[PDB]
Ligand binder design. Structure first.
Ligand SMILES: *[C@@H]1O[C@H](CO)[C@@H](O)[C@H](O)[C@H]1NC(C)=O
Ligand SMILES: *[C@@H]1O[C@H](CO)[C@@H](O)[C@H](O)[C@H]1NC(C)=O
Ligand SMILES: *[C@@H]1O[C@H](CO)[C@@H](O)[C@H](O)[C@H]1NC(C)=O
Ligand SMILES: *[C@@H]1O[C@H](CO)[C@@H](O)[C@H](O)[C@H]1NC(C)=O
Ligand SMILES: *[C@@H]1O[C@H](CO)[C@@H](O)[C@H](O)[C@H]1NC(C)=O
Ligand SMILES: *[C@@H]1O[C@H](CO)[C@@H](O)[C@H](O)[C@H]1NC(C)=O
Lengths: 226, 312, 81
């Protein structure tokens, strides 16, 4: 069942990536922002910046060096301002990408290089594995996560009074379907009879509030009896 | 988590209603569009930023009508229906503690404060009634003493400690919540980070507005005074000097704002992950969700930020 | 604007061309101040208050635990520059 679910999930990921055009939003946005920055930087040349013309040759010809100097200096101030603006915005964006890719590197380290108990870091749900997939100027992770599905709600009690001594579950919780009390692991309904192996005695009946009376089967008792 | 979504209007700032000033500014080709696009990008990421921090949950959970959590008192932290705005008393304390146009404008945040309080109440009610399950999948009810037994078992302390000191632990938790309320009420510099963010943004806007009064080497700092009393041939150069000064000032404002928006983005990514690993589940990450072995956490909205109550 | 028949007013500003709706749905085109416009069914642009989600009340109780019976191994795509 789990193998089929994993295969189907992989197939659905492929289909969703193929169908939805805005799935690769982050990488597409990075590329588009860089291209827009370059295009604006190039278009900055056409700007007069207060000079007579935006062409160095047109300034140099038709004007003698005395005021050609000041016209070219105005154009230089404008173009150097444009280039400083481009490189400052690019430094900002490079810091943003550096943060994103440090997050990508640590996500690789804690998700695919090992399992992460860090909640809601490697995909929503209890995390199982991850798979890096290269993408143009980026990385794509396939966070294989475990998600509970079908709730059944039972009656629970913090402890059990077997012989006047409280019994607490070693792993899991106490549940009951109405008549019989079972201890089960927390993330999956695996009811199984209360037994000294899965319950550790600690304390007295009266101290705990919510403790319910029951018997706790002793596995060694039939062995003694036989 | 965010700051004011200011969107300075490029042409209305650098130039008045005068057409000559706009015509001169058209020579500087795309500086103006760069600045406007940068500011809109900042505003959009602030909206996405609050959404990422708070909208960690899919269903808006509500706490049960009767507050019987085995002795734990959440009244100081759950919303109070009596008040008009559904905010917790601690949220009220935070909102009280945290405290025209030359072309500027402040865009309203996409999530109003009431909606953010509704998100935080959903997160808090889901936490109280379910634990980490409501973030790891579908929400699963569990008695709150049982959830604290889970958390103690998480920090390596067996459950019998909680189920045998439930009264003591409930009283300690209630007293700790009360002391948080009192310390927030008394200390005026508790909300230092949010107050500092607001003050820095206000100072940036005020400096930007004050930059209009600067002559920048021109004859005067008023476009009307430059146009009048001076004929066009040198009115052009005076206006150009003033435009260079004002555009330099606006570039400085937007660059500092890009720096500060990156800083806030880092802080609010930290807030989002702190939400995910502290309130959506218990964190074994040492000294991340409060000093000490971590048990729970509770988001509380604050103006342009978030406040956590790391129960440790 | 030409379409002056319906002129809604919100904290963001004067929204012309979209009719207000009491019902609340998820956000499609964010406007501001908790109002998101959308295109729904006889078709028109509707502006409405956002619905944060299906309000689910967990049946909390003193002795009620809900334990899942099966699971769904679900893989999710995370994309990072
Ligand atoms: C499970 O919860 C429902 C309400 O959500 C309740 O009616 C039902 O009685 C619960 N199950 C049991 C076994 O009590
Ligand atoms: C509860 O489960 C036990 C064992 O699975 C069974 O013997 C008993 O009849 C069940 N009772 C109810 C009310 O479901
Ligand atoms: C929960 O409340 C009911 C009455 O509302 C009470 O009888 C019961 O004892 C309470 N649970 C515990 C564990 O005390
Ligand atoms: C469990 O059995 C003891 C035996 O005397 C009794 O005193 C106690 O009340 C019982 N508890 C419950 C919850 O019935
Ligand atoms: C929304 O509610 C108002 C009441 O404030 C009422 O006019 C009507 O039900 C709705 N408004 C419109 C314009 O449909
Ligand atoms: C869990 O789901 C699988 C496949 O959907 C199927 O076995 C059944 O629906 C569930 N398993 C149970 C109830 O044991």
């Amino acid at each position: 069942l789990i193998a089929n679910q994993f295969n189907s999930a992989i197939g659905k990921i492929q289909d969703s990536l193929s169908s939805t055009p805005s799935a690769l939003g982050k990488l597409q946005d990075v590329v588009n922002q860089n291209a827009q920055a370059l295009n604006t930087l190039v278009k900055q040349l056409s700007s007069n910046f207060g000079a007579i013309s935006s062409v160095l040759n047109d300034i140099l010809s038709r004007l003698d060096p005395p005021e050609a100097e000041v016209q070219i200096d105005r154009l230089i101030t404008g173009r150097l301002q444009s280039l400083q603006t481009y490189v400052t915005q690019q430094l900002i964006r490079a810091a943003e990408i550096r943060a994103s890719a440090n997050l990508a590197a640590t996500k690789m380290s804690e998700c695919v290089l090992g399992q992460s108990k860090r909640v809601d870091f490697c995909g929503k749900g209890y995390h199982l594995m991850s798979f890096p997939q290269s993408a143009p100027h980026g990385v794509v992770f396939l966070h294989v996560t475990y998600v509970p599905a079908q709730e059944k709600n039972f009656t629970t009690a913090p402890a059990i009074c077997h012989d006047g001594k409280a019994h607490f579950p070693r792993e899991g919780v106490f549940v009951s379907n109405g008549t019989h009390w079972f201890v089960t692991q927390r993330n999956f309904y695996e009811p199984q009879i209360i037994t000294t192996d899965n319950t550790f005695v600690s304390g007295n009946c009266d101290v705990v509030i919510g403790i319910v009376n029951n018997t706790v089967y002793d596995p060694l008792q039939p062995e003694l009896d036989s | 988590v965010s700051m004011t979504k200011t969107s300075v209007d490029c042409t209305m700032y650098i130039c008045g209603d005068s057409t000559e000033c706009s015509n001169l500014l058209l020579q500087y080709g795309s500086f103006c569009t760069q600045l406007n696009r940068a500011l809109t990008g900042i505003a959009v990421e602030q909206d996405k930023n609050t959404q990422e921090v708070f909208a960690q949950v899919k269903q808006i959970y509500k706490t049960p009508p009767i507050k019987d959590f085995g002795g734990f008192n959440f009244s100081q932290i759950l919303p109070d229906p009596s008040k008009p705005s559904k905010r917790s008393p601690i949220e009220d304390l935070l909102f009280n503690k945290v405290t025209k146009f030359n072309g500027l404008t402040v865009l309203p945040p996409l999530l109003t404060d009431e909606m953010i309080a509704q998100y935080t109440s959903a997160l808090l009610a889901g936490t109280i009634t379910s634990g980490w399950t409501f973030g790891a999948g579908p929400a699963l009810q569990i008695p709150f003493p049982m959830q604290m037994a889970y958390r103690f078992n998480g920090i390596g302390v067996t459950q019998n400690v909680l189920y045998e000191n439930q009264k003591l632990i409930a009283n300690q938790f209630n007293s700790a919540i009360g002391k948080i309320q009192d310390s927030l009420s008394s200390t005026p510099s508790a909300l230092g980070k949010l107050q500092d963010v607001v003050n820095q943004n206000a100072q940036a806007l005020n400096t930007l507005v004050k930059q209009l009064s600067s002559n920048f080497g021109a004859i005067s700092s008023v476009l009307n005074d430059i146009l009048s009393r001076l004929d066009p041939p040198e009115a052009e150069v005076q206006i150009d000097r003033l435009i260079t000064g004002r555009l330099q000032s606006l570039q400085t404002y937007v660059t500092q704002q890009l720096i500060r928006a990156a800083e806030i983005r880092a802080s609010a990514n930290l807030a989002a992950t702190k939400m995910s690993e502290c309130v959506l589940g218990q964190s074994k990450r040492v000294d991340f969700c409060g000093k000490g072995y971590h048990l729970m956490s509770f988001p509380q909205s604050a103006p342009h930020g978030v406040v956590f109550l790391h129960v440790t | 604007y030409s379409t002056g028949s319906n002129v809604f007013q919100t904290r963001a500003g004067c929204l012309i061309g979209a009719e207000h709706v009491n019902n609340s749905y998820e956000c499609d085109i964010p406007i501001g101040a908790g109002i998101c416009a959308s295109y729904q069914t006889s078709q028109s642009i509707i502006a409405y208050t956002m619905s944060l989600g299906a309000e689910n009340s967990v049946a909390y109780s003193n002795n009620s635990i809900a334990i899942p019976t099966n699971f769904t191994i679900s893989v999710t795509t995370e994309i990072l520059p």
